[PDB]
């Protein structure tokens, strides 16, 4: 329940494709294989994008350095049906108009190869004030090494009272607006060269609403 801060350098995953720079920020609409979820029982969060967490350090609510948290009990990262990682901390923001943003600090205990049939990128037109989703011009695949930590994010509309954990099992589709937030640098190309600080919880408890 207490707020703990994660300071880390985001690092864009290098995707497997036949196009463009391999290191580019991509999101997943439809998976063809090793579909990425973070779930508790039947309830699942559909993972829409991933960045590597590099040089992480943790702080208490009072900004004293603390040790790595224990995994949140009973919540797991799965590729397909296989459990592939623990979850150290959870970030969830209940935004305007049922917008829900979830970020899991995932510590991989096994490798995974998520393959994306329909991809998504974030775009911004001259009349958008936030990033907005658009369709890839092709699919791709990710390679998630075991032992590495990843921030696995999800964006969608969901219901829930305040302090109720929300579940976004939906596909991410185009023209969905991702409201500015702490994790917004993880949606642009990140070259492991600057730190961000995000508030998290060692439980499945959301942050105070519209944040």
Which residues contribute to the site for its own copies (CB under 8 A)?
A: 7, 12, 20-21, 24-25, 59, 63-65, 93, 121-127, 129-131, 134, 136-137, 179-182, 184-185, 188-191, 193-197, 199, 210-211
* Rounded distance between C-alpha atoms, residue 5 and residue 69, angstroms: 11
Do 38 and 144 contact (CB within 8 A), yes or no?
A: no
Residue 66 Cβ, how far from Cl ion at the closest point, in Å? 4
- What is the contact mask toward Cl ion in residues 63 to 92, using x (rule: CB under 5 A)? ---xx-------------------------
Contact between 127 and Cl ion by CB under 5 A: the answer reads no
Rounded Cα distance, 10 and 188, in Å: 10
Which has the closest alpha carbon to 118: 187, 172, 194? 172
Name 132's bridge partners: 123, 177
> At closest approach, how far in Å is the CB of 134 from Cl ion?
43
Q: How far apart are CA 141 and CA 155, in angstroms?
A: 20
The partner in contact with residue 99, picked from Cl ion, Mg ion, its own copies, none with C-beta cut-offs of 5 to 8 angstroms by kind, is: Mg ion
**Smallest separation, CB 175 to its own copies (Å):** 13
């Amino acid at each position: 329940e207490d707020t703990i801060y994660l300071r880390f350098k985001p690092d864009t995953l290098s995707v497997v494709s036949n196009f463009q720079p391999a290191k580019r920020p991509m999101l997943a609409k439809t998976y063809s294989g090793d579909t990425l979820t973070v779930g508790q029982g039947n309830n699942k969060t559909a993972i829409h994008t991933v960045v590597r967490i590099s040089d992480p350090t943790w702080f208490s609510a009072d900004w004293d350095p603390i040790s790595t948290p224990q995994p949140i009990a009973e919540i797991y990262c799965k590729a397909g049906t296989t459990t592939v990682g623990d979850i150290l901390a959870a970030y969830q923001v209940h935004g305007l108009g049922n917008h829900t943003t979830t970020a899991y600090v995932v510590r991989m205990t096994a490798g995974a190869n998520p393959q994306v049939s329909a991809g998504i990128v974030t775009n911004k037109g001259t009349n958008d004030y936030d990033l907005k989703t658009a369709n890839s011009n092709a699919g791709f695949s990710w390679n998630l090494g075991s032992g590495t930590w990843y921030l696995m994010m999800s964006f969608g509309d969901a219901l829930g009272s305040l302090g109720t954990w929300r579940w976004t099992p939906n596909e991410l589709s185009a023209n969905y607006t991702i409201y500015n937030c702490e994790i917004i640098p993880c949606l642009l190309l990140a070259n492991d060269d600057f730190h961000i600080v995000i508030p998290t919880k060692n439980a499945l408890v959301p942050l105070v609403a519209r944040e």
